[PDB]
C-alpha cells in the first residue's frame, strides 16, 4: 500500500516528499500531490533517455550501455540536446567533416 504503488510509478513518493520539504525556505509547507507530479516527470524523462540510448546501443550489436551511447543518443535529438547542456565524461564527439575540406 505504498504511495508509489497507489499512483502507479517506480520512483518513490515519500522520499521525494522528504526532499522537497527541505528546500522550501522558511515556514513553507508542501502538499501531498506535488510529489506525485515530480515523480511522474522524472520517470518520463528517464524512460525517454534510456530508450534512445538502448536504440543507439542495439545499432552497434552490443548488449550493454556505455557513456558513448548516452552521448550519441542525446546529441542526435533536438529536444534532449537543448535540455541537457552538460559534459558527459567518456563520450567524445559526433563525427562530422565539412564539405569544402574533402
Amino acid at each position: 500500500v505504498s504511495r508509489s504503488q497507489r499512483a502507479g510509478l517506480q520512483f518513490p513518493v515519500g522520499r521525494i516528499h522528504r526532499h522537497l520539504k527541505s528546500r522550501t525556505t522558511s515556514h513553507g509547507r508542501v502538499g501531498a500531490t506535488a510529489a506525485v507530479y515530480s515523480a511522474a516527470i522524472l520517470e518520463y524523462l528517464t524512460a525517454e533517455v534510456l530508450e534512445l540510448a538502448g536504440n543507439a546501443s542495439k545499432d552497434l550489436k552490443v548488449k550493454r550501455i556505455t557513456p558513448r551511447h548516452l552521448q550519441l543518443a542525446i546529441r542526435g535529438d533536438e529536444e534532449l540536446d537543448s535540455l541537457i547542456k552538460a559534459t558527459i565524461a567518456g563520450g567524445g564527439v559526433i563525427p562530422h567533416i565539412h564539405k569544402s575540406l574533402i
Partner: protein, 77 residues
C-alpha cells in the same frame, strides 16, 4: 611546465575538432588560452577547499567550481 603540452597533442585536439590544415603560430595561442582557463577554475576550487578548513583538494570542489563557471560536468559526483 606549460611546454609539456606538446605540438602533437594540439594537433590531435585540432583533428578531433575537425581541422585539416594548421598554421605555425597556433600552439602558443592555445597554450595561453589553456593557462587562463585553468587559473580561473583552480582559483574557485581552492576557495571552496579553504572554506571547509581542509588541506586536500577533492573532486567535489572541482565539480562545484565548474558548475559555478557554467560548465557542468557529469560523471564525477
Amino acid at each position: 611546465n606549460i611546454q609539456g603540452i606538446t605540438k602533437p597533442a594540439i594537433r590531435r585536439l585540432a583533428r578531433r575538432g575537425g581541422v585539416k590544415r594548421i598554421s605555425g603560430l597556433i600552439y602558443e595561442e592555445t597554450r595561453g588560452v589553456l593557462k587562463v582557463f585553468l587559473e580561473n577554475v583552480i582559483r574557485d576550487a581552492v576557495t571552496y577547499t579553504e572554506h571547509a578548513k581542509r588541506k586536500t583538494v577533492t573532486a567535489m570542489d572541482v565539480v562545484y567550481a565548474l558548475k559555478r563557471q557554467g560548465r557542468t560536468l557529469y560523471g564525477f559526483g
